[PDB]
């Protein structure tokens, strides 16, 4: 009799298109960007994780290849996960909030045509 | 009785320090840089793989 593994495996930081009905959970190893999603048509999104007690600063990130800028800040003692959102190529970077924690984890899923 | 796999597996594009006495073989997926070695002290080497029949650029 073979037993299922308790977890499905710490896979590696790759790009792909995960099918639906599946939670993707991610733990951060470095600072800055953790993951980004997009359909490249009418939906672009990324996140950045920042250490607790960081001052309000504009920072630079190798996002979408072409490095971009945006503001970040965190005062609470938990890590802060700031999302950035865009509905078009010709648009501003709607900086959307958020996920705060000390687990150092993030989670996404596809269902009902909704992320 | 278990047998060895025919080859040690297509591992993933990581950074680390392979110990000695081990060939590291690499196949390229994209264009341009495939890998780089260094010691950050007195040695910095990289490679770039280029498709055949390319102009000097």
């Amino acid at each position, epitope marked *: 009799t073979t037993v299922e593994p308790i977890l499905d*495996g710490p896979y590696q930081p790759t790009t792909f298109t995960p099918p639906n009905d599946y939670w993707i959970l991610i733990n951060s190893n470095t600072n800055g960007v953790v993951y980004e999603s997009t359909n490249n048509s009418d939906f672009w999104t990324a996140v950045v994780a920042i250490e607790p007690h*960081v001052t309000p600063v504009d920072r630079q990130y190798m996002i979408f290849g072409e490095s971009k800028q945006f503001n970040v800040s965190n005062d609470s*003692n938990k890590w802060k996960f700031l999302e950035m959102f865009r509905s078009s190529s010709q648009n501003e970077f709607y900086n959307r909030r958020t996920l705060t924690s*000390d687990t150092r984890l993030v989670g996404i899923l596809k269902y009902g045509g909704r992320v | 009785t278990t047998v060895e796999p025919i080859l040690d597996g297509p591992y993933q594009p*990581t950074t680390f320090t392979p*110990p000695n006495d081990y060939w590291i073989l690499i196949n390229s997926n994209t264009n341009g840089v495939v890998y780089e070695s260094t010691n*950050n*002290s007195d040695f910095w080497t990289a490679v770039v793989a280029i498709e055949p029949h390319v102009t000097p650029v």
Partner: antibody
Framework: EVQLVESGGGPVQPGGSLKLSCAAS????????MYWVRQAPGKGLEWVSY????????YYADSVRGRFTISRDNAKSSLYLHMNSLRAEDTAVYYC??????????????????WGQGTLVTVSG | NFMLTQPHSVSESPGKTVTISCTGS????????VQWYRQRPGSAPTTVIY?????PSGVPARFSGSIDRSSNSASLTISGLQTDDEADYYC??????????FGGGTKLTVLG
């Protein structure tokens, strides 16, 4: 668990001689480096020696040239320092250790807190 | 090399947040990793932070750290200062060549 053991402490005549030993148990100690650092009041710990996979290459710190000497035994899995005839500043606790930085993935902690307790060695007479 | 200057002492009232820095005179702390070292006079010291912010298991969440790139420094933030925060806190990292670069003994004595 991982264990560092050491020995060789006691009073030391300046201009004298003795031996210091630091063996390790819980890890490989062939793919690691090993150093030594003397700790004392607020001068602070500092680098002493350097051995890393025996290239027939090593390094020494400022106040240890010649009168220290180092040896790294993979078999016994230890560092062996032969000590002679130095200034009284050597009154200190000697520490052996190595921090390892290689990208272990998630799912298991290969991480040490790599510090033996050290050995006290005072220069007196 | 770049020596790692420290505030040779610092304190606040225990029970709130405090910060201790460690600044490299030249070079760049962003070049490689930095690790932090708590120490007691009694027996022997222990590590508190490695890889510049990788908190180690067993040690509580009261500690954390980050890097100021522009000012060439690392820093640590401590929340909920216990009675046994009395310690010394060294910082150290690597040099242009891998031997190490160290910081002065930062004597942390917090009281009111």
């Amino acid at each position: 668990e991982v264990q560092l053991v050491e020995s060789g402490g006691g009073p030391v005549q300046p201009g004298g001689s003795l031996k210091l030993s630091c063996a390790a148990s819980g890890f490989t100690f062939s793919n690691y480096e090993m150093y030594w650092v003397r700790q004392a009041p607020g001068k602070g710990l500092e680098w002493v020696s350097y051995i890393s996979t025996s290239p027939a290459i090593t390094y020494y710190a400022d106040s240890v040239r010649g009168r220290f000497t180092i040896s790294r035994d993979n078999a016994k899995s230890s560092l062996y320092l032969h000590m002679n005839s130095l200034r009284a500043e050597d009154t200190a606790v000697y520490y052996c250790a190595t921090i390892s930085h290689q990208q272990f993935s998630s799912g298991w902690n290969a991480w040490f807190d790599p510090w033996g307790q050290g050995t006290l060695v005072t220069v007196s007479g | 090399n770049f020596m790692l200057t420290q505030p040779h002492s610092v304190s606040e009232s225990p029970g709130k947040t405090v910060t201790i820095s460690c600044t490299g005179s030249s070079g760049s702390i962003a070049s490689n990793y930095v690790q932090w070292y708590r120490q007691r006079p009694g027996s022997a010291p222990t590590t508190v932070i490695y890889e510049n912010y990788q908190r180690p298991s067993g040690v509580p969440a009261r500690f954390s750290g980050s890097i100021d790139r522009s000012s060439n420094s690392a820093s640590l933030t401590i929340s909920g200062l216990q009675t046994d925060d009395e310690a010394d806190y060294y910082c150290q990292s690597y040099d242009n060549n891998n031997l190490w670069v160290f910081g002065g003994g930062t004597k942390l004595t917090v009281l009111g």
